[PDB]
Amino acid sequence: EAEFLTVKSTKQWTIGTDVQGSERLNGVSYQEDALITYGDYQYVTFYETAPAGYLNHFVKVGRRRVSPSVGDWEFLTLDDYTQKTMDGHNMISMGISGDGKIHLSFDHFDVPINYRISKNGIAKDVPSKWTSDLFDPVVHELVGSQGPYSPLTYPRFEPLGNGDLLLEFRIGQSGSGDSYIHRYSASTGKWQAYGMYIQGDDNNAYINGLDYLDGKLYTSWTVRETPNADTNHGVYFAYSNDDGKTWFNTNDTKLTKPISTSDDSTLIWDIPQNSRMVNQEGQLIDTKGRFHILMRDLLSGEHQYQHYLRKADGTWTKNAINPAGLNGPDLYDPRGKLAGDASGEYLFGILPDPVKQSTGIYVATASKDFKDWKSLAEIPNTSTEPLFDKTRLHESGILSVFVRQAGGFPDRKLQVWDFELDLLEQKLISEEDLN
Ligand SMILES: C[C@@H]1O[C@@H](O[C@H]2[C@H](O)[C@@H](O)[C@H](O)O[C@@H]2C(=O)O)[C@H](O)[C@H](O)[C@H]1O
Ligand SMILES: *[C@@H]1O[C@H](CO)[C@@H](O)[C@H](O)[C@H]1NC(C)=O
Structure with missing residues (x-):
């Protein structure tokens, strides 16, 4: 008896x-x-140029039924707010709370917060007409909380286990x-300020994400001295047991509030x-x-993706990710992600190749200490930092990935790629070959 994680099927959609x-x-x-499943529906957000004709850029939101069968993508365009900052740093972050409300934050580079929310719980009480008037107008404050809301960059959303939603940003x-956290109550529709949780000393923290499991909030960051x-410099770690009010290091030592x-x-x-x-x-x-x-x-002597593991007992290991045919990325090459299956045995590396203009889906196993990286699939013709749908992977075993293609405008498309996972148990029965 052994188990293998397999890709049963592969499909793609061109969504813009x-x-x-x-x-x-x-x-x-x-x-x-960027890509979120809530109940029966998957949601995606991205920038599109206005159809008439080139100056105006709008936030676009797609949804499709993904359960109990996959339906067609449909789109709304939020054509009441043109994007002021179309540089590298202004992308959309989206979150969905336990009241089924959809939150958007976008168009940031050292400017005041830009935020909007659905009028109603459109992911719980699902409207059949999917139009822009489902969303309230753009606001530059969080009702019930306090600033500073400027100069703001990098809205990050994190759904908590009780329907509430964190918003984090620099x-x-x-x-x-400095880095701040605010908490949305699914129960009241009000934000409360958790305040500054990292204070820069003539520098800033850059967090890699927000992860949540069984009442615990995890994050990791590096520190940036100049633009x-x-x-x-540095790979740092901290976790909170109260959703970002109180923080502890890897040794479980409590930390100063900032x-x-x-x-x-x-x-x-x-x-x-x-x-x-x-x-x-x-x-x-x-x-x-x-x-x-x-x-x-590049510390090993070669440029390579590095996997840091914090084994549950507080002990750290660092192991380079060098599966066959993966070109190691330099500082300015597209950035990857890690995803996990429901069981927790299978770790996916979603790693854009810096040379091949493609994204690799690599898998490793906890049994072999995450050193057994296998090529499981490849998304071809990408110039993208891959983003996936953690909810749909956990609750349907489908790895759904938003990608931007390589190539020039207008050949270059935005796509969603669905890799249907199939965990296979293998029985090998010895049988008779005798006369
Ligand atoms: C590496 C770079 O980092 C962020 O953008 C920076 C950028 O380094 C530079 O123009 C200046 O430092 O402004 C940005 C900032 O204030 O954060 C982003 O992660 C970029 O996508 C990335 O290329
Ligand atoms: C605290 O954590 C660091 C790793 O982050 C480790 O090197 C050190 O041994 C730990 N110290 C204590 C007192 O546990």
């Missing part, structure tokens, strides 16, 4: 034409999140910024500046409470 420009303006590493800028990406970038009690690996480690890559809490970080560095 990518926006014109030199910069990547869809499918970017720090989007949290205030200040590159090489001088130049070469000036990232964590300082200067305090190395949170440091879990020494990575100096100019190690070619990029900010805002990937992390994961697997369903067995093991914590993962995806970064990269």
Whole structure:
């Protein structure tokens, strides 16, 4: 008896034409999140150019039934708010709370918060007409909470276990910024300020994501000294037992309410500046409470993706991810993600190849200490930082990935790729070959 995680089927949809420009303006590493399943429906958000004709860029939201059968994508366009900042840093983050309300935050680079929410719980009480008037107008504050809401970059949403939704983001800028958390009550529709949880000391933290399991909130970050990406140093870790009010390091030592970038009690690996480690890559809490970080560095003597593992007993390991035919990325190459199956035995590396203009779905196993990376699938013709649907992977065993293609405008499309997983038990029965 042995078990193998397998891809039963592979399908794709082209959900739009990518926006014109030199910069990547869809499918970017720090989007949290872009593709979300809530009950029977999958939701996606991305920027599209206005159909008439080229100046205006709008937030677009798709939904499709994914249960109990997969239906067609349909779209609404939020054509009341044109995007002021179409540079590298302004991508959409989307979240869905336990009252079925859909939250959007977008169009940020050191500007005041941009936020909007559905009038109603449209993911719980599902409307049949999918139109832009489902969403309230854009606001620059969080009702019931307090700023500072400026200068804001990188809205990240994290659904908690009780229907509530965290919103996290940087205030200040590159090489001088603080990180704040706000909590939405699904129960009241009010935000409360959890305040500054990381204080920059003439630098800023860049978090890899927010992960939640059994009452515990996990995060990991590097520290950036200046606006130049070469000036990232350190891989840090902390977790909260009260959804981001109170924080503890890997040794379970409680921390000062604002964590300082200067305090190395949170440091879990020494990575100096100019190690070619990029900010805002990937992390994961697997369903067995093991914590993962995806970064990269050239420290081994080669540029390679690095897997940091925090084994449940507080002990850390670092192991390069070098499966056959994966080109190791440099500082400015597309950033990847880690996903986990419901069982918690199978770890997926969703790793864009820096040369091949494709994204690899690699799998490793807890049994073999996550050192057994196998190529399981490949998304071809991508120039993207892959983003996936953690809810749909957990509750349907389907790995659903938002990608931006490689190539020029207008050939370059936005797509969703669905890899139907099949965990196979193998019985090998010895049988008679005798006369
Ligand atoms: C590596 C780079 O980091 C973030 O963008 C930075 C960027 O380094 C630079 O223009 C300046 O530092 O502004 C940005 C900032 O204030 O954060 C983003 O993660 C980019 O996608 C990434 O390329
Ligand atoms: C605290 O954590 C670091 C790893 O982050 C480790 O090197 C050190 O041994 C730990 N110290 C204590 C007192 O547990």
